[PDB]
Design a protein around this ligand. Structure first.
Ligand SMILES: Cc1cc(NS(=O)(=O)c2ccc(N)cc2)no1
Ligand SMILES: Cc1cc(NS(=O)(=O)c2ccc(N)cc2)no1
Ligand SMILES: Cc1cc(NS(=O)(=O)c2ccc(N)cc2)no1
Lengths: 396, 729, 402
């Protein structure tokens, strides 16, 4: 019945982990800044019609605890009837908020919902929230807990991706990310962060090393347990894991946030908003918790059956660059064309602010569909714990 | 990242250099442009050169000593420059303190011990210079003070004070003790809390003890030589970090306890200090130091700082520098004071006069009443003995200077009369006439009058020259202002003698020309009347008191109206109504007069009669009278809270402009400080006159916006909010 | 478009805070015990059709961190495609999980979803996650942060609820909770917690004080065992509610919700979903609504949220047979009863959190399944469940028996 439309999709720049510009900025004030930008774009928007604010956050502790979404509603002066809820599905928390918001609009019990995520990894490091899956000896044996870097190395070992193969995609992501910045692709969707005085704090992606060379990537080097032995205990047909993933061919640890406004056609009509894309379908899948990073392939196929589409029907494929082997495995399975996959750079170059990544690359595809005058795009991410998500958008 | 203020394309130097054969550099600060080392543009370049030199010659330097060749050490910064910082200049303000702290951070992280030779006042940025050193030795000299009084001017310790004090004592202790109120510390108390480490007798021992401490530190502590406790691997912030369970259990109460004490007033300085302190404890020192700069630039470019820097610095300077004093007059010393009447005022005048070392004779109508007036001074010394703020040797000599008596001849040898009898004109003529001849001939004849003009009171004495108005405020032991009223036949020497007397007892004087109501009691009349009229209009008493507290007043208006006594407030209106009808006119009464008269009919006319707007029992104040709502139909009028606040603030600001127009006040400085220290005007406004030029409402900022808001109040509440022609065009 | 139905809604007994029986039980084990119970009810159910497991958790730290729902999916051996996600909307997280699960079914992109919550407050106390609204002086000022204890006393101050009034409802809750337990109302929905050897750990809401007397509740002292005992929050609250002179502190530990451990699980699915797995529907999710309120009183949220869910379903106050409001504080319920003229015989007929406890993230799903079993026992049709939320929010849900 009610179709869900994307009206605005903005994001903050990504400040690097060490000596980052966003290290002095609380993660709450990052979300408030994006709320003020939506106010600037639509000053006559009736914020009373905004019924919920959904944010994704993998480490909701400290500066990110206590329902950071509700804190963003009250600190920004939004109406108290605007809700505010925080969710966490590991790496796909940002896109899960978008999907849940769209599903809330389709049910008819929500008219205008803000969705997104925030993750200040320099202030709240990964794993600060603890977790029974990793810090409880009973569970850490049942789920066969292994860090995602080893699951990625296990992917490259089985599929046959060499160190040069993963470093090739790493160099490719750095080149396409700089070309997007130089071309002004991210000019309108990247809202620079400023202090309480208006002074600039950050206006670009710091983690990008655009002058990367294939010789420098090979200089990089690839961790205190038997996670290798634990992984090979389930994958008994492979003798040794080839650790090909370094800091230059994996996702970057950065701080950042992203916001997406989702509503029905009547919500934008009443509030004078113009739709930019339509949420076609969403799907949730998973794969075994050892390899962990093979969720995209079954999740993408599931979202294609729902929409009745194939790989040849999609114009752009956006997969989160958590690790290089994850993208090469996803590209090899579905035979994704090399010119449709992460066309405006990826997380290896720009970063992976966990809870905000799924909402960042979501709006990134909204821009490229409108820039190329294309039609469809499929956004997917690999999830910790062995889950997978997928979302198809159609330009309007 | 440079220690200098310009990377592009001529100030003086204020720091001396001296390296010894041992390798110790003595940085002696001596600003030639003034008698006090301030954090001006010259100091930044002077220190920028020295710190650059400490690095290029680090192979021949074993330690550093920071001394001063002035009476003080380093008192404050350049207020004349900061008060002009526009919001556009936020980038330059941020880079300035970031450059200042970049110098101190290198001095601090030099691998060599740095000792401070605090030879005097180390206030504000000066203490920030000392906190950057690894060891501090203070000379226990008289007059030396150490603190961070940046909050009193509307600013914050932006040269590393907030970041370093939290690193030494934690968020809670550094905020309350040093940062929040900017309290000044004596050298003994400074060593006691942790600001200073050692003490010496004279200033000639500082540099020797500084170099001696360097030699022993390099000998017995070679590894930790020149390393602060937070630059070590195992630094544990005292009291914990915001990520600590013990501190996290009480951390949410700091903004509420601060809002509890500020009473909801718009004072962003303490709020910003607490923010920078907690945000600073979550990150490293350098990241915290940068956050401190952003909150600092947030206050300098604001309006509250420009009001508090105008009042509590520039306006306070002109007053203490003889701005209101009559010029070309000598100082006639005081030998013995005689206070007439031993009530709450007369006893308070006798205490503050005897605490300054003056022999006071306390006369009343009986020995039972005069000695009981001296008991007001005894009951305060017993409080200062329990708190440990005075000694028995110095307190027994304090009460010994108070001679309570009832015989008028005991006023012999008195060269300074301060009358505090009842508000009755012929009584003051009767009181002064009994003793005008017993006192010395050239004695000051002062009168603590609230409304009666000094010109009329002076007719009851033979020498109208030495008759002057010395208006105090209860409680006299705490209220720091003395409103001096100049009668028509009052000479100029009497103005200067009472002016010097005010500074002698540690108070602030203002000079006011003789007029009905003077300036303090007249302007405060428009304050309590706007609340009483508001109560008669049907506004909830709880909303009135809340609006009065959130405006910035020390006491809510209805509570003040019980201590001001409503029967006297009825007498003022009858006196004002008489003067208009005596001159053949038509008196336009204030809507608050009917509220006063109604309280008289019910028998609740203030605290003195055990009942007023509040219920009183067991001496203390219980609560608002339950019969107040049904009497005035409270709740039938619910104006916005900001209208209640503005109606009280604008009534005083507009009434203050009349005093400047009518010739009552002669300077804008006496209008601001006289309203702050006199009637309790909110300090964030910078004074009742500064409130006009520095008004910051939702419609604008400045005199043009003040007039606009006055016309909003005028068209909605009455013509009394119409601005005079002196504010128009 | 697709109708969402409740097929099973179970919960664990609520173990008290001090010397509690569930203190030694990891909160993840509380959810796996409920997952294993569903398999005991329907052994032939193809768990591959379960596409998501949604749990509410207000303090997702320590034993409750790292997507505890995913840990439940993996530790209990559920299919790896069953997802898992945690959500935090303060006191209504347990119902927000079911409302989101229902909305996930209405979109048609999710068929069978498990929803519920878990909160072991004896192991993970409230505030363990921190938060900018509490531990940031800038945010703690813009958002006038005042704990729920003062907002509850402020409601009783404005509406005129005396100390005997709030204590009367506390006795009312303890009485109706004991009648429900002694009457066997909870026999089939409260799954007793056992250990790795099948030994009984807890089989009742051990926070209940059933022999409570009016004289006993009067001897209790006002709340001063938390953040409220520190100070300033009364002054801060009255700075906004400036027409109120004094806040009457009437809420104690006997008229407020109980600190307990527990968990709840609800299985929501479409009509075709339960048909394929052979599941009989028990109720239908009619409508949900979410409206907030002033963040200082912060507990008047149920009043507008209940009206918006009635207007969406075309129903009035007279069409609801049972009302279930979370007994966070006595004044929150008396305010809700006074506003909408709720008859006393329809409001929390089987006790509430004052007697049985309030396991934050799991309460919304616990009191939800309570009404699903009471609608069948009374053979009634409609029931409305609502909760007050921290920060000044509200969530309401209408269910219809099938
Ligand atoms: C540390 C840390 C956090 C973290 N979370 S994770 O990478 O999302 C993860 C979750 C489940 C499993 N089974 C493995 C990894 N993993 O390590
Ligand atoms: C403060 C302060 C000054 C002050 N002046 S006062 O002279 O005490 C006074 C007396 C009566 C009335 N109606 C007004 C002021 N009263 O409080
Ligand atoms: C401490 C602490 C956390 C906490 N959480 S809370 O009760 O959910 C809450 C949330 C928002 C506001 N404004 C007040 C309280 N309550 O106290």
């Amino acid at each position: 019945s009610e179709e869900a439309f994307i009206y605005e999709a903005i994001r903050t720049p990504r400040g690097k982990q060490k000596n980052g510009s966003l290290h002095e900025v609380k993660p709450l004030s990052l979300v408030v800044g994006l709320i003020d930008e939506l106010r600037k774009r639509h000053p006559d928007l009736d914020e009373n019609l905004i019924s919920d604010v959904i944010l994704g956050c993998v480490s909701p502790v400290g500066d990110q605890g206590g329902d950071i979404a509700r804190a963003a509603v009250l600190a920004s002066g939004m109406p108290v009837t605007s809700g505010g809820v925080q969710l966490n599905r590991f790496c796909a928390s940002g896109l899960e908020a978008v999907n849940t918001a769209a599903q809330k609009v389709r049910s008819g019990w929500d008219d205008l919902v803000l969705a997104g995520g925030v993750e200040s990894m320099s202030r709240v490091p990964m794993g600060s929230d603890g977790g029974a899956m990793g810090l409880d000896p009973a569970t850490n044996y049942d789920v066969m807990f292994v860090p995602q870097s080893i699951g990625a190395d296990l992917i490259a070992t089985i599929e046959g991706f060499s160190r040069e193969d993963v470093d090739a995609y790493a160099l490719r992501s750095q080149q396409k990310a700089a070309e997007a910045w130089s071309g002004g692709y991210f000019a309108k969707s990247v809202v620079p962060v400023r202090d309480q005085n208006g002074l600039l704090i950050l206006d670009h992606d710091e983690h990008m090393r655009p002058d990367t060379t294939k010789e420098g990537l090979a200089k990089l080097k690839p961790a205190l347990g038997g996670f290798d032995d634990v992984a090979l205990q389930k994958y008994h047909w492979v003798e040794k894991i080839n650790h090909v993933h370094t800091g230059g061919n994996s996702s970057g640890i950065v701080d950042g946030a992203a916001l997406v406004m989702i509503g029905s056609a009547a919500a934008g009509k009443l509030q004078g908003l113009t739709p930019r894309a339509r949420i076609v379908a969403t799907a949730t899948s998973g794969a075994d918790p050892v390899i962990m990073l093979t969720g995209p392939t079954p999740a993408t196929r599931k979202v294609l059956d729902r929409a009745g589409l194939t790989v040849d029907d999609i114009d752009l494929f956006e997969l989160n660059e958590a690790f290089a082997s994850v993208v090469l495995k996803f590209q090899k399975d579905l035979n994704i064309p090399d010119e449709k996959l992460n066309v405006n750079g990826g997380a290896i170059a720009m970063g992976h602010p966990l809870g905000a990544t799924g909402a960042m690359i979501l709006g990134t595809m909204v821009d490229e569909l409108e820039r190329r005058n294309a039609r469809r795009a499929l956004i997917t991410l690999c999830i910790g714990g062995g889950m997978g998500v997928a979302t198809i958008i159609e330009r309007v | 990242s440079s220690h200098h203020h310009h990377h592009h394309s001529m100030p003086d130097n204020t720091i001396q250099w001296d390296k010894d054969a041992d390798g110790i550099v003595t940085l002696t600060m001596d600003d030639p442009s003034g008698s006090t080392n301030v954090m001006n543009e010259a100091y930044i370049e002077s220190m920028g050169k020295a710190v650059d030199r400490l690095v290029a010659e680090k192979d021949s330097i074993t330690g550093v000593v920071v001394a001063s060749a002035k009476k003080t050490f380093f008192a404050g910064g350049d207020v004349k420059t900061m008060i002009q910082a526009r919001p556009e200049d936020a980038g330059d303000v941020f880079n300035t303190v970031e450059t200042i702290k970049r110098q101190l951070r290198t001095l601090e992280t030099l691998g060599k011990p740095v000792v401070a030779a605090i030879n005097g006042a180390a206030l504000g940025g000066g203490l920030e210079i000392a906190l950057a050193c690894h060891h501090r030795i203070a000379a226990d000299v008289k007059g030396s003070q150490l603190g961070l009084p940046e909050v009193t001017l509307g600013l914050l310790p932006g040269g590393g004070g907030v970041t370093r004090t939290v690193r030494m004592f934690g968020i809670q202790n550094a905020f309350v003790s040093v940062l929040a109120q900017g309290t000044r510390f004596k050298p003994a108390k400074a060593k006691e809390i942790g600001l200073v480490d050692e003490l010496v007798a004279t200033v000639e021992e500082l540099v020797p003890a500084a170099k001696a401490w360097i030699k022993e530190e390099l000998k017995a502590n070679p590894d930790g030589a020149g390393v602060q406790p937070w630059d070590k691997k195992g630094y544990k912030m005292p009291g914990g970090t915001p990520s600590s369970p013990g501190l996290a259990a009480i951390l949410p109460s700091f903004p509420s306890n601060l809002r509890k004490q500020l009473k909801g007033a718009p004072m962003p300085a303490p709020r910003a200090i607490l923010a920078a302190a907690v945000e600073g404890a979550q990150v490293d020192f350098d990241t915290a130091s940068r956050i401190e700069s952003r909150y600092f630039a947030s206050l300098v470019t604001g309006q509250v700082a420009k009001n508090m820097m105008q009042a509590f610095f520039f306006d306070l300077q002109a007053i203490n520098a003889g701005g209101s004093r009559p010029e070309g007059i000598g100082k006639t010393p005081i030998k013995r004071i005689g206070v007439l009447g031993a009530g709450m005022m007369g006893a308070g005048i006798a205490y503050v006069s005897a605490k300054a070392g003056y022999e006071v004779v306390l006369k009343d109508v009986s020995l039972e009443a005069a000695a009981k007036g001296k008991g007001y001074s005894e009951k305060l010394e017993a409080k200062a003995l329990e708190r440990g703020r005075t000694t028995q040797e110095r307190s027994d000599a304090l009460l010994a200077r108070i001679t309570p008596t009832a015989d008028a001849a005991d006023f012999k040898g008195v060269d300074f009369v301060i009358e505090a009898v009842f508000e009755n004109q012929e009584l003051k003529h009767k009181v002064f006439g009994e003793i005008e001849d017993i006192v010395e001939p050239n004695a000051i004849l002062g009168s603590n009058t609230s409304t009666l003009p000094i010109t009329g009171l002076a007719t009851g004495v033979k020498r109208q020259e030495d008759f002057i108005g010395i208006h105090f405020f209860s409680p006299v032991d705490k209220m720091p202002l003395v409103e001096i009223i100049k009668g028509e036949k009052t000479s100029d020497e009497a103005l200067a003698r009472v002016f010097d007397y005010t500074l002698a007892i540690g108070k602030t004087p203002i000079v006011v020309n003789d007029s009905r109501g003077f300036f303090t009691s007249r302007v405060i009349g428009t304050f309590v009347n706007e609340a009483l009229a508001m109560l008669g209009e049907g506004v909830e008493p709880a909303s009135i008191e809340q609006a009065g507290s959130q405006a910035g007043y020390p006491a809510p208006p209805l509570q003040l109206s019980d201590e001001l006594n409503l029967e006297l407030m009825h007498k003022i209106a009858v006196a004002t109504r008489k003067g208009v009808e005596d001159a053949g006119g038509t008196y336009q009464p204030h809507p608050a007069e009917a509220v006063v008269e109604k309280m008289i009919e019910l028998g609740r006319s203030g605290r003195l009669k055990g009942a007023g707007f509040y219920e009183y029992a067991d001496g203390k104040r219980s609560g608002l009278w339950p019969g107040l709502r049904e009497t005035f139909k409270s709740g039938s009028s619910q104006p916005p809270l900001q209208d209640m606040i503005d109606r009280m603030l604008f009534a005083e600001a507009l009434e203050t402009q009349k005093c400047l127009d009518e010739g009552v006040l002669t300077s804008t400085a006496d209008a601001n400080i006289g309203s702050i220290m006199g009637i309790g005007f909110p300090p964030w406004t910078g004074g009742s006159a500064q409130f006009i030029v520095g008004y910051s409402g939702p419609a604008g900022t400045g005199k043009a916006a003040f007039v606009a808001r006055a016309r909003e109040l005028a068209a909605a509440y009455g013509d009394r909010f119409l601005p005079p022609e002196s504010l128009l065009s």
